[PDB]
């Protein structure tokens, strides 16, 4: 064939891939974390938006830290050979490097490590997108007119 | 050839390192509101980093906190695109 360029990810596999949405609204009382009013609007918006991009959306609500880790592990062990990409959206409380399960924190590295090129071979070379709505600390941006 | 185990990840953070992130109890979070709007408008048109740059602009320009607490009032937010991608990403093909 003619000249070929290799500058863009192959996105014409049979499936776009999974879009996992973790929507943590209600937290165990003992954590002291507030209920994240408005997060259901986000989760619905994301579901519709990624639906129209032809992702296979899975919405999960109010997962413990243990459930988050097991969900990610299980998803990373699926066969993604026929999928172009992978998307995970995390909606929760957070701190720098950390997302909260309903009962306590999860290191973000623990979640993303399941999808490393050496640990999820059917996603090697494919884009893995992590979209994170969560605090990264307590600084406030005062802005400038 | 090998590829790095951290290659081909993109982290679309709602806020800059060290900062709070803002969520409106009625409308949803500033970042997710803006992300969905920009994907709806531009996913058939723009490469993903350029979509996310429009999201940065929308969050930066169109939102400012309102609070009865002076500590939390009139505050701004910028999201933070972290890319280890090795190719351009378009959600469309052909």
């Amino acid at each position: 064939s003619g000249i070929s360029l290799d500058n863009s990810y192959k996105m014409d596999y049979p499936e776009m891939g999974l879009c996992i949405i973790i929507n943590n609204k209600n937290f165990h009382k003992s954590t002291g974390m507030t209920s994240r009013s408005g997060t259901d609007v986000d989760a619905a918006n994301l579901r519709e938006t990624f639906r129209n991009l032809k992702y296979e959306v899975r919405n999960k609500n109010d997962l413990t830290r243990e459930e988050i880790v097991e969900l990610m592990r299980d998803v990373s062990k699926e066969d993604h050979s026929k999928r172009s990409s992978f998307v995970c959206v995390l909606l929760s409380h957070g701190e720098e490097g950390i997302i909260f399960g309903t009962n306590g924190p999860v290191d973000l590295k623990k979640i993303t490590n399941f999808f490393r090129g050496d640990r999820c071979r059917s996603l090697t070379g494919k884009p893995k997108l992590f979209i994170i709505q969560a605090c990264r600390g307590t600084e406030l941006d005062c802005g400038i007119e | 050839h090998k590829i790095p185990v951290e290659a081909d990840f993109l982290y679309a953070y709602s806020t800059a390192p060290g900062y709070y992130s803002w969520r409106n109890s009625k409308d949803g979070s500033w970042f997710i509101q803006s992300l969905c709007a920009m994907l709806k408008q531009y996913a058939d048109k723009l490469e993903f980093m350029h979509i996310l740059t429009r999201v940065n602009r929308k969050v930066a320009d169109e939102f400012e906190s309102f609070s009865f607490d002076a500590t939390f009032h009139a505050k701004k937010q910028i999201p933070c695109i972290v890319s280890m991608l090795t190719k351009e990403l378009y959600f469309y093909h052909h």
Partner: peptide, 4 residues
């Protein structure tokens, strides 16, 4: 407006 709330914080996360």
């Amino acid at each position: 407006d709330e914080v996360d």
